[PDB]
Amino acid sequence: ACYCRIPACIAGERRYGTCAYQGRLWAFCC
Ligand SMILES: [Cl-]
């Protein structure tokens, strides 16, 4: 499933773009 993550996606995931939410930027990870 896909999550917004701070600070980075973990192994086994890949990053597919970015979230801006609550004044922070997040990796969008799947
Ligand atoms: Cl980040």
Numbering used by the authors: 1 to 30
Task: Give verbatim lines from the article.
Defensins are a family of antimicrobial peptides of innate immunity broadly active against bacteria, viruses and toxins. They are small (2–5 kDa), stabilized structurally by three disulfide bonds, form oligomers, and are divided into α, β and θ structural classes. The canonical dimer interface of HNP1 is formed by the antiparallel extensions of the β2 strands stabilized by the reciprocal main-chain hydrogen bonds contributed by Thr18 and Ile20, and the hydrophobic packing of the side chains of Tyr16, Tyr21, Trp26, Phe28 and the Cys2–Cys30 and Cys4–Cys19 disulfides. Further analysis of probable quaternary structures by the Protein Interfaces, Surfaces and Assemblies (PISA) software indicates that the HNP1 dimer forms a tetramer or dimer of dimers in a crystal.
